[PDB]
Amino acid sequence: PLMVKVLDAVRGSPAINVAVHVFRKAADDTWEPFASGKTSESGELHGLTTEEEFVEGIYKVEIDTKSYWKALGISPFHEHAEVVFTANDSGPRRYTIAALLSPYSYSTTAVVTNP
Amino acid sequence: PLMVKVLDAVRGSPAINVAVHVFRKAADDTWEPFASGKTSESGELHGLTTEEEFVEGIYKVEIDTKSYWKALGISPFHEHAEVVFTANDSGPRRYTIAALLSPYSYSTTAVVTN
Amino acid sequence: PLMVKVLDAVRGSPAINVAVHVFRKAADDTWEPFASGKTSESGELHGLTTEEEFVEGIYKVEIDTKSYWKALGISPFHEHAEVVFTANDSGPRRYTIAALLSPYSYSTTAVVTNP
Amino acid sequence: PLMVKVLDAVRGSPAINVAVHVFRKAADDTWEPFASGKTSESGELHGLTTEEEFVEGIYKVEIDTKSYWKALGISPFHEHAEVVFTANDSGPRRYTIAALLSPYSYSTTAVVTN
Ligand SMILES: Oc1ccc(/C=C/c2cccc3ccccc23)cc1O
Ligand SMILES: Oc1ccc(/C=C/c2cccc3ccccc23)cc1O
């Protein structure tokens, strides 16, 4: 129900081994750790959560872009890329959070489908 | 030293009257309010800070994209768009944070000049 | 060896039924029709060409964005989105041409992999 | 009436000294040269045309991205970036064509104002 896809606009490749942290806003308005992982050789991160665990809420997907660029010898502009959204407020959906990275720029889009 | 520019990819226009909040990371790792305003008719927010106040540090620019889309009657995906970066005195000294908005997507770039 | 993926930044969905025309620059410097098709329900267009047919050259991928938006009741800015690139000049590669569409904006990236 | 702005997403800077060619579609469906220049130190190209010359029609803005990346020693994907659009007198009358460049990607938007 939640997938993250990361691409590299400099190399024209998947962004491999990118750390991703997901948080859910708690009743006390704090960010609770929800799930985390690293992108694969295809730039994708699957298996973060289940339909049962991925309840209504406000979620934050943090993509560790700075560590990614530093590993390639680029001192980038951003600390990270954060994507913050309400999920599953009209019932369960499938979410793909996609990011396209450059050293001084990033772009993000969502693909939301109803199973 | 710090300018924010916001554009609308649906209407092909500046994003006018968008709330923007700037925070600086404190020593306790919390976000301290730093500056804020609403974008002009040109989609720009000037006069956020001075060279004296804008010291090295980690800054967050929060753009209230959700209110912007709701005001146009368009269902948006994001709660807001956040841009988090380090200001470095070794780098050039004027920072433009630009954002291009769509209902389910945003893009941001930095233009850093002397 | 050539795949096209198109996403809609307004609806947060694949861009379905988008016409795509591919051209190859001929020896006389004209654009020769090479392949064409329409994006699927996933926003993807597969099966445009084969490793054998997809020789070295300069290729143009034309995505008919204007017809797509008009069908959704939006008068868009661009006539089309064109992606022009040299392919296979260092031997065969796999190319994904991806586009993210808004009425007054588009973004494109390439993912190039070596089988 | 027509301005082109080009930004570099790798260096976080204006894209300086980029060749830009503008064409207008002729009645025989060929691209007629209309205007051209090189981007300034601000990444901008002004003075391409006048209100009198910039009549309704189909225009193409060609940005020589390949030469730009080659000059930086960076291997690029695209031969160039082309932006093709209709100028419409019913719409607002100033057109900014903006492009954000990376070696394997570009993004473009239109800012159309009165
Ligand atoms: O399965 C896929 C899912 C999402 C993307 C995204 C592609 C993209 C293209 C062009 C611009 C972008 C801007 C931001 C995020 C993604 C993009 C690509 C895939 O192959
Ligand atoms: O004075 C200006 C300063 C910044 C921008 C930005 C334009 C842009 C274009 C194309 C893609 C983008 C993606 C993210 C952010 C900005 C963009 C435009 C201006 O006229």
Ligand code: NA
């Ligand atoms: Na609900």
Ligand code: NA
């Ligand atoms: Na060769």
